[model samples]
Target chain A: ENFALEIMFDKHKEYFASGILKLPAISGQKKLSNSFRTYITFHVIQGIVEVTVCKNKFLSVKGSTFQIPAFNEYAIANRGNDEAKMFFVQVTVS
Target chain B: FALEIMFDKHKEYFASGILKLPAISGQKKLSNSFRTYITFHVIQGIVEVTVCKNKFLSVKGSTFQIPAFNEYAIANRGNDEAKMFFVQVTVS
Candidate 1:
């Protein structure tokens, strides 16, 4: 189970990045903000997913949304038997 | 317009919230006064969206962005209730 990111929108002028996030069953991605800035919000579209922020974990189901602050340590994992899909938006802070 | 703001934080930098509309027929108009970089994600049900007099249907899992100074509206045309997650960021 591997995590994948499908970028839908990337507009530098808007100073934000948005895309769909996919997680296979029982798979997870750690240190999500290691490559880029954090300040991200995610809304679950299908299945159940767990979000960890600074070692704190929370469950988000379909139609639920969560946000991670800028520069925070985070991880996302699929907690359900099926694949999970989430729409995410990350805004840049200067 | 039955508009309810579930959560509104950081109005100075950006504001985010959940908007719920009743089943069958629910509508809300976003006036021009609300000038912000607004992004909307449809969480539940089908939504008919109108921006600058342009109309389109946004189903579940659909996402759209509206720039500042644009007037928009959203209507639920489905049988069940509809919900939308929105983020508004102030911009020039």
Candidate 2:
């Protein structure tokens, strides 16, 4: 609904958590690229998510996956032009 | 009660929906512990799942992989809840 974020999963604990995440169109800047533990982002659509993680910039779309191991900086958005959509999973492992 | 953990065939590249795996639905602990699944997508609430009795903690988008022959479980407690769609294969 209006592109916020859809999180799929059940409950919690002190160390781990997971589920599917859908990201909407984005452009012009990066946000929320810092965190603790290993954050793994696996793209679910082809040629959709273009990202930059701590100096390592990659255009991730469909099956294109990358992991940010604790304390790394990163940001992701649409291909940066036209329209876009992306489905993916984010893992935070402690 | 039951979680859609896999698909033999997928008409839609992926199918998804919201599943309320009732927390406080079981005995001997917090809420309920449903059947073991490698990992399902977290679309709404909080969920603690592990591939190992030692490793299934996750967030919305994180996937826990179960190795071939290895089994896992989903512990949805409290407002403890979760969701997902399609396929599981252990590439050995």
Candidate 3:
């Protein structure tokens, strides 16, 4: 019998949660908008990525985590020679 | 906003957030706001908690709750010091 990946739990609007993410390999760079939620992002996969916010700079890689405050403008780009994967979470008070 | 480690336990549970803890006759003062909810659990040692100068209790290797606007603090008068983790949830 063949089985496929299925979600075991429905996501809830809570103060905390955890998950993983996957991204495809690309030649160029991309940027995302600032979210209205306060959260923290952790790098689970081993890949290089450049993160910038105002004059502050950071590199998101394996085992490193960054705290992003609510409504703060930031940007990220894939700087590795291969595909990049990241795991992050959005935490807010309900 | 900052994490601090107190070397003692509380002597009473002061619901008003005003706690004057004495350890070895030395006083440790702490004050908290009513708009803040604090939940703490002791990982080691015993603690004395006092609230509102009337409601008093002692905690050891367990958890407790300080409701919003309810002031409380810990004092360790025993021979051993206590270690506790407390998180503050701010309410609007």
Candidate 4:
């Protein structure tokens, strides 16, 4: 398992979700993820990881954000000497 | 006020939803006690946000961030319905 999810907050109203993700030091390790709805991910540590969506890529640093649509895929990798961390959420707007 | 979140398929991260003022909870005084980064996205409503950096923000269909050691106070100032989406970083 590459990610251990924690339930810190939960709710809905046409809805969304929230959690924390921790990855190891710059190893380019990745795993498949839930892509049932549109979701957004944020960089927990500044300049520590790279996130790829479709064919595009983002060097997610502190405060950087990326959004992906349904039926799509994305991946993240550590680019620093230490562990990488982040918080994300997916909200379906129809 | 409600927030809906979802996640599926092993992706880079998980979570999401809209946030509205709770019927019981009036305004939200959000602070960054130990957080380095905090952001908010306005989707379908209007939110009046104030950062401890002495910053005042009012936007719809836009976003903002609170720097490290900074906090913010956001609330539904509109009569209709004020909602927004936010994300943060927690380093452990």
Better of 1 and 4 by TM-score: 1
**Per-candidate DockQ versus the true complex?**
0.35, 0.05, 0.03, 0.11
Rank by TM-score (best first): 1, 4, 2, 3
CAPRI-style class, candidate 1: acceptable
Sort order, lDDT high to low: 1, 4, 3, 2
Instruction: Please provide, for model 2 over A10-85, each residue's C-alpha lDDT reduced to its tens digit, 9 standing for 90 to 100.
Output: 4443112333444544554334456355444443433466666667667765543445545666666666443443
> Residue B83's C-alpha lDDT in candidate 4?
61
Q: Model 4: per-residue lDDT, tens digit, A1-94?
A: 2343653443431123555567778475654454555445653533477777688776876545566667666677778776765655544434
* Pairs with backbone N, CA or C atoms under 3 Å apart (clashes), candidate 1: none
TM-score of chain B of 1: 0.78
Which candidate model has the greater DockQ, 1 or 3?
1
**lDDT of candidate 1 at residue A15, scale 0 to 100:** 42
Order of candidate numbers by DockQ, starting with the best:
1, 4, 2, 3
For residues A1-94, write the lDDT of model 1, one tens digit per residue.
Answer: 2233566665744445677887768564332433245466777889888777777889899877787777666777778888888777767676
Candidate 2 lDDT by residue in tens digits, B1-92: 44443222332222232345566535112222233223344544455654445644566544443334444455654455444322332222
Q: In model 2 chain B, where is the ten-residue run with the lowest total lDDT?
A: B27-36
Q: Any idea how many clashes model 3 has?
A: 20
Find the candidate with the highest DockQ and give its number: 1
lDDT of 1 by residue, B1-92 (tens): 44544444652234666777776664544456255777778888798888786899999888887778778778888888888787766765
Instruction: Give me the TM-scores for chain A across all models, comma-separated.
Output: 0.76, 0.57, 0.66, 0.69
Off by over 4 Å in 3: A1-15, B1-92
Predictions in order: lDDT: 0.71, 0.44, 0.47, 0.56
